[PDB]
Amino acid sequence: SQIRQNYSTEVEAAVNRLVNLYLRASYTYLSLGFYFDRDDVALEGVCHFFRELAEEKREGAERLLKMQNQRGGRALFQDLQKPSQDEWGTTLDAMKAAIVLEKSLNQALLDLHALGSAQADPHLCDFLESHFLDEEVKLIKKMGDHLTNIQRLVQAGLGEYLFERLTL
Amino acid sequence: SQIRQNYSTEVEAAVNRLVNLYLRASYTYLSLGFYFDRDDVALEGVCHFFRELAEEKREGAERLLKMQNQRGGRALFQDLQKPSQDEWGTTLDAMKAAIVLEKSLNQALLDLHALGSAQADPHLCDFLESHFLDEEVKLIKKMGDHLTNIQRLVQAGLGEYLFERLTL
Amino acid sequence: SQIRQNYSTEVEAAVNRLVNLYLRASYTYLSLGFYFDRDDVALEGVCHFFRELAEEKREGAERLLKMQNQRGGRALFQDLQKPSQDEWGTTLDAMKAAIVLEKSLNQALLDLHALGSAQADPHLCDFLESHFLDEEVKLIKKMGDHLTNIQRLVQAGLGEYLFERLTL
Amino acid sequence: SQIRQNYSTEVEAAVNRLVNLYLRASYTYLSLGFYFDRDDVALEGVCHFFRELAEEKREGAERLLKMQNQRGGRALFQDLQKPSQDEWGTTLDAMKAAIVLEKSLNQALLDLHALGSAQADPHLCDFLESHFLDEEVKLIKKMGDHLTNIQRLVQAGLGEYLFERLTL
Ligand SMILES: CC(C)c1cccc(C(C)C)c1O
């Protein structure tokens, strides 16, 4: 590439892998959202919470792809694996799966940051810090807060209704 | 009729029967609404839910009657039978009766659609699809969602109060 | 499902397959869009055209999933296959691939409509006609119009620039 | 300096060198801009493109000088060498020279970042990342995009006119 400068093949490949992880996460949240929209589940606030996250993760993938092109790297897409479950249980089960998913995304971001530092790529390091690292910390804190409130509420049906009505 | 074209006597008769079913449904919802307004029942949100449905079903009957005249058919009214119960039990009992009622209306609409298709009456088919079929699907989904939340909430008195306060 | 009425298992399965096709199409358009954003391709209007289509196809999948739940069917997601190409050639090549893709989506919609008619499911038939069939016809006409103008313009570099500047 | 803290003499010297490079770049763009304003060249959009860049590079030098004083370092100015050419050829030649110039500025920024990291000077590292590194990546991507479009357009006179009219 005529514009490529200080951008290693290792970072380029890791960025493509991270795009795939963000799109997989968006797909997982799409599945979580529509599960809570089932007439036999029917928790609208929970459906809204996860649909908003599907949108945020798709936006993250798109930002990564834009950065890949700005640096002269080449986007390469892979098959997007289906989510790990077809049915997601209670709000508590769903929030626990979501925090597992976010921690895995955060770890991938931290691994990519470490790779960037190793490769002396400060543009990459700044990009991640600016657009992703703090967003993930904030989101994981919010999910942890939700998990604590859900757990405090377990008359489990009553608690699940109240959380959806009064928090979400 | 000077204007009548492609409108069978079978469809004309079925439309009159459907008007009677819609007016019977409006009457049933009027009864449900005022039951929840009793001082010894006293669930205002539930009363409002059913009074709004009585209005929607009367409007449906009026749309059908307007269509009957647009096609050159002749409205024929029959005695409107009183609702199946005088007292309607809990919110849960009431919502179960309402979903039974809506499924019966939906089935009558589907039967009339099938009759229209058999008679090659596409104006009728479009009319039903446009004004009734989707309205019924949406309403039945909403009632199913409510039933699931009511069931999750059954300390049954506490749950009935909370549903009326926080959903309706 | 407590709400399910006149909704066959065959239609339910076909709707899940159609969701997968719409999400695959959105993914294909995401790939097309970012390819035209490469510094060595650099056709912004073309990138915008395809990114807007990725959004439209994702929205289509979401509408289908909402309908699946309204009818009492159960969403089932499958692995999303990667797009058929990694690099998309000229604007002409890309527009030809897009019209192939849209014709395949349109055929799937027509097949689902035929299945609905066979199953006497008029809600499904109306849903498809209202939200999808006309959108596809309009889009395919627009792509055909673009293909004709692109072909008329092939000094091929000059023509590709002018189309992006003055049409897109 | 009473305020100087964690600011090495090596960084101080490198910052002064970088100021000189930014001012040299501003001077080069001033020359490029007025060349395209010649009556025998007469490409107004190209003149505007380069005059705007002369302004951006002067602003960069001024930000660096402000930072030098904030840290307690001492600005030292050197003779500003004249630009490498007196006449700049075609728009294509000019854009190629501009991308060479920007890549040299970007490399100097990356070298200064590496020096800062070596000296454990995180204020410097943040300053560069915040105000310069991303600006350079964006600008180099934009120039690469322009070069690709210029090259696609080479009836070379016609292509040069069209690019100036429809892109710049
Ligand atoms: C945002 C969310 C609905 C989503 C899930 C799965 C795949 C995609 C794209 C890649 C088609 C997607 O946008």
Ligand SMILES: CC(C)c1cccc(C(C)C)c1O
């Ligand atoms: C009791 C109720 C369903 C009803 C019956 C008959 C006529 C009307 C008018 C107001 C349309 C009506 O509202």
